[PDB]
Design an enzyme around this catalytic site. Structure first.
Site, PDB file in Angstrom:
ATOM      1  N   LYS D 192       0.855  -1.242  -0.011  1.00 38.77           N
ATOM      2  CA  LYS D 192       0.019  -0.042  -0.046  1.00 38.77           C
ATOM      3  C   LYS D 192       0.998   1.177  -0.009  1.00 38.77           C
ATOM      4  O   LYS D 192       1.347   1.565   1.041  1.00 38.77           O
ATOM      5  CB  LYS D 192      -1.006  -0.077   1.147  1.00 38.77           C
ATOM      6  CG  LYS D 192      -2.322   0.735   0.802  1.00 38.77           C
ATOM      7  CD  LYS D 192      -2.383   2.150   0.751  1.00 38.77           C
ATOM      8  CE  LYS D 192      -1.845   3.061   2.018  1.00 38.77           C
ATOM      9  NZ  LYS D 192      -1.594   4.296   1.701  1.00 38.77           N
ATOM     10  N   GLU D 268       9.098   1.174  11.317  1.00 33.40           N
ATOM     11  CA  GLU D 268      10.148   1.984  11.027  1.00 33.40           C
ATOM     12  C   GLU D 268       9.857   3.474  11.106  1.00 33.40           C
ATOM     13  O   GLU D 268       8.912   3.720  10.169  1.00 33.40           O
ATOM     14  CB  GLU D 268      10.932   1.666   9.768  1.00 33.40           C
ATOM     15  CG  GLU D 268      12.448   1.733  10.094  1.00 33.40           C
ATOM     16  CD  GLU D 268      12.834   0.545  10.938  1.00 33.40           C
ATOM     17  OE1 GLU D 268      13.027   0.520  11.991  1.00 33.40           O
ATOM     18  OE2 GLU D 268      12.842  -0.572   9.909  1.00 33.40           O
ATOM     19  N   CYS D 303      14.421  10.273   6.967  1.00 30.32           N
ATOM     20  CA  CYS D 303      14.216   9.805   8.384  1.00 30.32           C
ATOM     21  C   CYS D 303      15.727  10.073   9.181  1.00 30.32           C
ATOM     22  O   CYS D 303      15.700   9.988  10.261  1.00 30.32           O
ATOM     23  CB  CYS D 303      13.772   8.275   8.389  1.00 30.32           C
ATOM     24  SG  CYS D 303      12.766   7.839   6.636  1.00 30.32           S
ATOM     25  N   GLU D 398      10.071  16.248  15.202  1.00 26.78           N
ATOM     26  CA  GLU D 398      10.360  16.102  13.738  1.00 26.78           C
ATOM     27  C   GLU D 398       9.658  17.040  12.688  1.00 26.78           C
ATOM     28  O   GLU D 398       8.622  16.798  12.537  1.00 26.78           O
ATOM     29  CB  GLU D 398      10.047  14.547  13.137  1.00 26.78           C
ATOM     30  CG  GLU D 398      10.595  14.130  12.147  1.00 26.78           C
ATOM     31  CD  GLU D 398      10.472  12.669  11.659  1.00 26.78           C
ATOM     32  OE1 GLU D 398       9.219  12.229  11.795  1.00 26.78           O
ATOM     33  OE2 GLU D 398      11.187  11.994  11.237  1.00 26.78           O
TER      34      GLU D 398
HETATM   35  N1  LIG Z   1      10.445   8.786   9.059  1.00 23.32           N
HETATM   36  C1  LIG Z   1       9.806   8.197   8.029  1.00 23.32           C
HETATM   37  O1  LIG Z   1      10.059   7.427   7.354  1.00 23.32           O
HETATM   38  C2  LIG Z   1       8.627   9.368   7.757  1.00 23.32           C
HETATM   39  C3  LIG Z   1       8.229   9.977   8.505  1.00 23.32           C
HETATM   40  N2  LIG Z   1       7.015  11.110   8.305  1.00 23.32           N
HETATM   41  C4  LIG Z   1       6.604  11.940   9.259  1.00 23.32           C
HETATM   42  O2  LIG Z   1       5.365  11.837   9.293  1.00 23.32           O
HETATM   43  C5  LIG Z   1       4.506  12.816   9.199  1.00 23.32           C
HETATM   44  C6  LIG Z   1       3.429  12.824   8.610  1.00 23.32           C
HETATM   45  O3  LIG Z   1       3.359  12.231   7.222  1.00 23.32           O
HETATM   46  P1  LIG Z   1       1.973  11.216   6.288  1.00 23.32           P
HETATM   47  O4  LIG Z   1       1.981  11.311   4.921  1.00 23.32           O
HETATM   48  O5  LIG Z   1       0.941  11.214   7.082  1.00 23.32           O
HETATM   49  O6  LIG Z   1       2.645   9.806   6.920  1.00 23.32           O
HETATM   50  P2  LIG Z   1       1.963   8.513   7.568  1.00 23.32           P
HETATM   51  O7  LIG Z   1       2.817   7.880   8.575  1.00 23.32           O
HETATM   52  O8  LIG Z   1       0.455   9.189   7.957  1.00 23.32           O
HETATM   53  O9  LIG Z   1       2.031   7.607   6.138  1.00 23.32           O
HETATM   54  C7  LIG Z   1       2.773   6.122   6.012  1.00 23.32           C
HETATM   55  C8  LIG Z   1       1.790   5.518   5.287  1.00 23.32           C
HETATM   56  O10 LIG Z   1       0.708   4.963   6.117  1.00 23.32           O
HETATM   57  C9  LIG Z   1      -0.687   5.364   5.614  1.00 23.32           C
HETATM   58  N3  LIG Z   1      -1.684   5.734   6.547  1.00 23.32           N
HETATM   59  C10 LIG Z   1      -2.030   6.908   6.766  1.00 23.32           C
HETATM   60  N4  LIG Z   1      -2.918   6.916   7.754  1.00 23.32           N
HETATM   61  C11 LIG Z   1      -3.321   5.427   8.055  1.00 23.32           C
HETATM   62  C12 LIG Z   1      -4.352   4.813   8.768  1.00 23.32           C
HETATM   63  N5  LIG Z   1      -5.014   5.571   9.489  1.00 23.32           N
HETATM   64  N6  LIG Z   1      -4.034   3.620   8.651  1.00 23.32           N
HETATM   65  C13 LIG Z   1      -3.395   2.921   7.678  1.00 23.32           C
HETATM   66  N7  LIG Z   1      -2.557   3.427   6.992  1.00 23.32           N
HETATM   67  C14 LIG Z   1      -2.387   4.736   7.106  1.00 23.32           C
HETATM   68  C15 LIG Z   1      -0.325   6.207   4.453  1.00 23.32           C
HETATM   69  O11 LIG Z   1      -1.224   6.415   3.248  1.00 23.32           O
HETATM   70  C16 LIG Z   1       1.055   5.973   3.873  1.00 23.32           C
HETATM   71  O12 LIG Z   1       1.070   4.838   2.966  1.00 23.32           O
HETATM   72  C17 LIG Z   1       5.485  13.880   8.119  1.00 23.32           C
HETATM   73  O13 LIG Z   1       5.225  15.086   8.125  1.00 23.32           O
HETATM   74  C18 LIG Z   1       7.063  13.400   8.770  1.00 23.32           C
HETATM   75  O14 LIG Z   1       7.385  14.033   9.921  1.00 23.32           O
HETATM   76  C19 LIG Z   1       6.533  10.832   6.759  1.00 23.32           C
HETATM   77  C20 LIG Z   1       6.978  10.041   6.087  1.00 23.32           C
HETATM   78  C21 LIG Z   1       8.089   9.129   6.070  1.00 23.32           C
END
Ligand SMILES: NC(=O)C1=CN([C@@H]2O[C@H](COP(=O)(O)OP(=O)(O)OC[C@H]3O[C@@H](n4cnc5c(N)ncnc54)[C@H](O)[C@@H]3O)[C@@H](O)[C@H]2O)C=CC1
Ligand SMILES: [K+]
Ligand SMILES: [K+]
Ligand SMILES: [K+]
Ligand SMILES: [K+]
Ligand SMILES: [K+]
Ligand SMILES: [K+]
Ligand SMILES: [K+]
Ligand SMILES: [K+]
Ligand SMILES: [K+]
Ligand SMILES: [K+]
Ligand SMILES: [K+]
Ligand SMILES: [K+]
Lengths: 496, 496, 496, 496
Positions: D192, D268, D303, D398
């Site tokens: 996904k 992660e 990250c 972050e």
């Molecule tokens: N450390 C890392 O590898 C990452 C950290 N981030 C951090 O997270 C913050 C938020 O970014 P987002 O785009 O919202 O990341 P996210 O953590 O919400 O998204 C990661 C994945 O989870 C999915 N997802 C989102 N809500 C979900 C739910 N309720 N149930 C199941 N799957 C779900 C998203 O569609 C995406 O494919 C960023 O501003 C940044 O600070 C975001 C991207 C990568």
């Protein structure tokens, strides 16, 4: 399975080959310092194939010197594992691009059937090089549990210039079994192939230069045993020798080390491998298929070959019948005829040694149940000798030809005792339907591999090598081959 | 840190010892078949300690035969790893209960000082046995990635009857380094100790019986090099020999293997170990403290001893000064006197070799900056010889006495070239405050251990052993010692 | 086997016990902050045994704080692996010295028979602590194959304060399974045992202080599930929780982590373990011996217990006959009578849950072939129910008592499908004489252990834990238990 | 280093791309069952790229079902490791042939600059797949030391259907980090991806079919977080989920596991990574070069990004000065312009979060020493904010943008306490010339990687993953990634 050509088409490929003839030292071909050569002849026809440089201690000195400089350089050794992997993968590609050429050339110099050279030897050679290239950047060394006041690593380093002395029964595959792990480890190597089968190693060395193996890192020095192999084993700048061949000759390399610089020596030698067939097998015809393959693949010129069939008295006859029927499927002749699973033996002298055990069987008045014939002074029929007791010379001595001895037993304790009644310990096969019996046979037979309900040598990831007089100090294939060519270093850093 | 006794108190323990005298074969003491003995004497006094059985090829044949019968019927090796661990732990407990007895006995026979016998040798011996006992039921073998049609295990099995030939410099500790891993792996062992230092091995073999090591599994055959060591190396039923001693003698065991049954040989030999001191160290007094310990622990009768000090010209003098200061804490004399860190050399013959190098220093007109004297024909002072060039005999040859050569360098590339200027490669130490320099000295010195900012041999968990002419085929201590005494077996089970 | 005492002698030992009653925090006993207690009663008699401190989030906060300080201190964590091993070995000694006391105390609090408490639970507990103590200084971490320009290590570090939540069926053994690896790794632990079985963990904590486990490194906080276990799982300073118990409750700890500090959670949960008996077994009575033991050891209060007998239709009846005969050897009653292999169930409430499946069997009109009786409102007879289809609630639900379901099959493909028809996957047993069948059953049953031709859970060196809903994120026992309590760190040092 | 094209040339590749739009399920493309789509737009322009299928629980159910059927019938996992390696290598070859196509597509959907897409993302993606393909037939499982009466193997089996939920910052690389090990282990995978960055995953899944990954083994289900990610985490036939993204979202997958089938969860997550610079570095310009790359590679959407510069007061100013100089080489703008090292942030929503931290800096009256501006509502300059105290929101949270906080220390104990002052622990870098300081910073910073004298994430062979709230239960890359997707099984075979 790549598609087999016709007899005429292989002959056509043979006719156009520019056979290598000179030693390969420091990046290119060169004649022997003394300009002598020796004859390489096709054992199945008698035709001269090439006049190959006949190297001696002088040529060996040059080859070792070019390897020593390359090792001290770092030109190969200092590339990253991922970089060494890339270059060895390039080499394997080139072998694949030249597969038909190398298969025909291997057949001509050795007598081996083109069918198996194309389908087995060449693919197995290419896969050995790929496996060991891929392995190098997957190997982790260690850190020791010494506490907070120190940081202790236990790591591995290339041992240095490595001499690789090869036999003639699987020239390319044995070449790959050795250079794979040794080059991947970052050693420079000096390869002394068998004089019977020197051509394809020379060609592979040239292809390795094209692939970007630097000059001096992979040299090939053709010549005789005493003339070229002994100076290599005695050379004070060779750090390690890996040898495959007879026990008799392997013993010399222990002396060579002892009398020179205490180089590490690893020996892979002969065997007298048993095949144990219990009376509780589920499919006797499938057993017979495995026994015939084990005994007669590559004409029995095989360190892992089944040479002692140790069979339960109640199934001996039923098994011998199915063995005879399987043998009808094993055509022998003209090694360039793709219809043949059996080619010529390697040389008149080896043919004479095998045929001497035919004579010995008749001297001992043993029943020759199948086979027994010779052709063209170079072909021996697959032969099965019944009623062979442990006191027979056919039971106790490595023949290295298509000759299977048959011994009966009454219970599994006798089968295991018979199986271990040898000074060797290279390989073994066991056939049984019983979990209990299979665990006994695989745990109590003293051999470096025991295959159960099949015949073979494992695969690229399983170590191969001998107990007792079948080997000394190491294993080929698998991650443990890497140990042959490296030293262990403890780096202990105080941090108190 | 156990509490030292008075000189008189050690003398009283010595006066009450019932010293072992007989070969230990098949669970008990027995005389040599020919009835011969040899005189074991206290090297510090000349007094006879015991007339020890002088075994020959016939006694060796009996010891091997009992070890073979024990191996074949599984009385030891068929016990579980956890059971073998328990008996070995019993043994180490017994050594601990007899620590004072064993320390005094070790001193008497060797000339080693009682202080180090009590605080180093015995505890390290006891610990070696415990670690290898504890290790055996933590070792995992492998299964190979061969797919769904087969199950392939890659297991280790005990190699068989193991010959263990020991030197005189660390009698009990070397014994533990060998029998620890070898007994834990399930082998039967025949130990041929040095004739100078046979008493303690005999005592331990008796305690091993008490601890439940079955009869025949741990035998001790005292006697001479040619008389007992050679028949052991040539014996057709000994599967493996592990040797620690000179390179010259170790070379012979390679020949014995070649000329008999191709038994595995592992050699641990001499060294000429460097100590590299950079001009950027943070504490020159502490460096001096480690360099003194590395050169003069056990009177320099030490395979890992610092014998070539390779020091930056800017710190040479200020280091030497603190070395002299340190040497004032190193008292020499009567081995039973707890005040002494230095005892007697092992024999008049060895004292002669060591003194001939003191004479060689004077012949070469070298500056003897500290020590240089002898006492009573058996003691040698800790000696530091300055301005030793790589061409000097004191730079190139193993002295095995308390004699430190000193050589200057200007840049770290020259230090590295000097450290590797040797046919040996057992150990090395390196002192520097620089991360960059530490990594460079760690990686580029061709030795089996490089200690950084300390002197030592690692601990129980790290492998010890030589590159080049310092070793052949293996490592003592650590989990890698297990490899010496085991064979790899691929069990390939068809499941098609 | 240690010698069993008489009923009267165990009663005498019971009468003299000073049962622990208070929480063990920061080096000694202390009452709960709110001074409440809960009743610990002997389930076989009803007698009150002790009023145990009834801890809540306040006490948990104190225990975690003392563990956090000890971890930050280094008081335990900074000792060398060899030192941590020494102290944990001292602890195991003390348990051994107190073996009869702990065995009787375990029996009184739990209902478990004194015979198995003395011969199994206590020795297994002592051996678990010894094995993991011995393991720690045998574990090597890694260095990565990154080339000459960098030095990359991959090492392991203690995760921090570790919460250990335990069940009641094997109080001491489960305690050792957890504290062994966790303490050896250098974590501080906070143990919340089952309220049904809190006494022996409290005693072991006191003994650990005597052994030199520093204050705050091993705390025990008795109390209820919601009252004490939930605050531990939610605590923002606990780095990791290891849990053993029901799936239903294990799920909560995933929530607790998600809603607090993302602590690592490892779950070991229930199972519905099959026992597959083929028609080609060599000894049916020996199979029956293993099935009876698997189903009824510890009264079936066993995560690894055989609860689905999946038996070939041609041997079902012959097997049921031999099972009935084996059951005559299984005496149940007074847990302090050494003649009993079966004691009381843990509590009135658990007794009611088991007995409810007796009722469910009768509701479903299933044939109760053996057993079916209750005694004293706390003993259930070993019961065998024939004709159980996969739709039965007895087939699908964990009973955790002495109740064996029996299902027939016609070919091995149906046996395997039946065996896997569960949401669980903890353990399995398979019985067959055929190599072919044994490989199928052990490779295709989806469980964390498959035993072949025996019943059990492996030994100290084999990992134990569940596929699917029988576990989450780890394994107990073996070297892999160490992974539960450590973090992996890559240290990458440039050297270019 | 492959050759960059002109801005116009990339624009021409972009104008010709046939962008994927549909879910990839069971070997081919298909629409969502409900027929919904969502708009994927180029974040640098606002232009629509494609209307992508907006999958929901029903589509997830179909994708899992096809993955389950493929798992059960063994079309992928019953192939040998060597065969699975070959198909994965085919896949990586195909990505290499479509490198430019994939790099432009990656840039269009993400805003990532084409230069880094071509030189970093695609080659690292291609390499990740090759390494994990090459690894699978080099992995050995174990046999345990259980003695002679049993044979015990400890093997790994694929866990089943695996859910892989990806973030938007490294779409292709994160994809490879997950599917590399998971497909090599033999799992079926349902991916996904982030809705911002779904196009390239779809393209790869199509290329995987071309490469012989069988139908159902590698599926991609694009859609929203709640709409597609949640049903995947709750699905009762998904055995394991690996997640990379925010801590907040990762917490939800622990609840989904708890509330469904107890599937394994590996998280992660984010970090707040420090960069510790000691006052004893040998080259302040090179430190500046590594600190700039660590903070502003991929616009700080990383990250592992350096976000807290923790610098010794003596070198603070002279470092900042060289940092400014370095920043002059970092051009920002049009992602298809090969001159730019910095492209557009991923979305207007993320640009808002990043800018609110720039406003927060001003609110806190902090010295913005470099950068601080925005362009076109979607670009942010590399920003360095000096004098940030640990109490600042910019120190603790972050930001995931090109924003570097700077904090001074006086001694290394304070530097270490500052580096660990966080709930996270993903990565850390440390610069020092001192061996003593390097070991101290390496060991005491609680992060999953500590790079010394460089910035980075290790290489393919080293594990990457967070301590504390940066991770849960696993590590990506290295051989340890294999553990995420496999179950341990003890096969205990009686042989008594
Ligand atoms: N450390 C890392 O590898 C990452 C950290 N981030 C951090 O997270 C913050 C938020 O970014 P987002 O785009 O919202 O990341 P996210 O953590 O919400 O998204 C990661 C994945 O989870 C999915 N997802 C989102 N809500 C979900 C739910 N309720 N149930 C199941 N799957 C779900 C998203 O569609 C995406 O494919 C960023 O501003 C940044 O600070 C975001 C991207 C990568
Ligand atoms: K020839
Ligand atoms: K011979
Ligand atoms: K050597
Ligand atoms: K003596
Ligand atoms: K010599
Ligand atoms: K041998
Ligand atoms: K109770
Ligand atoms: K439930
Ligand atoms: K965590
Ligand atoms: K988009
Ligand atoms: K959060
Ligand atoms: K699970």
């Amino acid at each position: 399975m790549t598609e087999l050509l016709s007899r005429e088409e292989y002959a056509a490929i043979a006719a156009t080959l520019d056979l290598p003839q000179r030693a390969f030292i420091d990046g290119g071909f060169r004649d022997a310092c003394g300009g002598r050569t020796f004859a390489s002849t096709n054992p199945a026809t008698g035709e001269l194939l090439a006049q190959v440089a006949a190297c001696d201690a002088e040529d060996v000195g040059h080859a070792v010197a070019s390897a020593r400089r390359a090792f001290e350089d770092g030109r190969w050794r200092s590339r990253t594992p991922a970089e060494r992997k890339a270059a060895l993968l390039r080499l394997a590609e080139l072998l694949e691009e030249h597969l038909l050429e190398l298969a025909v050339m291997e057949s001509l110099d050795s007598g081996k059937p083109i069918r198996e050279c194309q389908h087995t030897d060449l693919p197995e050679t290419i896969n050995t090089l790929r496996w060991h290239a891929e392995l190098i950047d997957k190997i982790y060394d260690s850190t020791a549990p010494v506490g907070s006041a120190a940081l202790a690593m236990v790591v591995r380093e290339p041992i240095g210039v490595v001499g690789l002395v090869l036999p003639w029964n699987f020239p390319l595959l044995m070449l790959a079994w050795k250079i794979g792990p040794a080059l991947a480890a970052g050693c420079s190597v000096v390869v002394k192939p068998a004089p019977e089968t020197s051509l394809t190693a020379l060609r592979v060395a040239e292809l390795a230069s094209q692939a970007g193996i630097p000059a001096g890192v992979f040299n090939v020095v053709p010549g005789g045993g005493r003339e070229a192999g002994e100076p290599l084993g005695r050379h004070p700048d060779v750090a390690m020798v890996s040898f495959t061949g007879s026990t008799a000759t392997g013993r010399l390399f222990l002396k060579y080390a002892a009398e020179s610089n205490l180089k590490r020596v690893v020996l892979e030698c002969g065997g007298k491998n048993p095949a144990v067939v219990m009376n509780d097998v589920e499919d006797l015809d499938l057993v017979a298929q495995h026994v015939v393959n084990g005994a007669f693949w590559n004409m029995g010129e095989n360190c892992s070959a089944s040479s002692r069939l140790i069979v339960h008295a109640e199934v001996r006859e039923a098994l011998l019948e199915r063995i005879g029927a399987q043998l009808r499927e094993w055509r022998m002749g003209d090694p360039l005829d793709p219809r043949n699973r059996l080619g010529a033996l390697v040389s008149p002298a080896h043919f004479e040694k095998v045929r001497a055990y035919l004579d010995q069987a008749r001297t001992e008045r043993l029943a020759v149940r199948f086979g027994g014939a010779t052709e063209a002074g170079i072909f021996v029929e697959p032969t099965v000798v019944d009623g062979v007791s442990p006191h027979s010379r056919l039971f106790r001595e490595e023949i290295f030809g298509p000759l299977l001895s048959v011994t009966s037993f009454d219970d599994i304790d006798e089968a295991i005792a018979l199986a271990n009644d040898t000074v060797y310990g290279l390989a073994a096969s066991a056939y049984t339907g019983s979990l209990r019996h299979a665990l006994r046979l695989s745990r109590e037979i003293r051999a470096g591999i025991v295959t159960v309900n099949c015949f073979g040598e494992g695969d690229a990831s399983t170590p191969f090598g001998g107990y007792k007089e079948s080997g000394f100090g190491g294993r080929d294939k698998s991650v443990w081959a890497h140990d042959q060519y490296t030293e262990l270093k403890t780096i202990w850093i105080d941090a108190s």
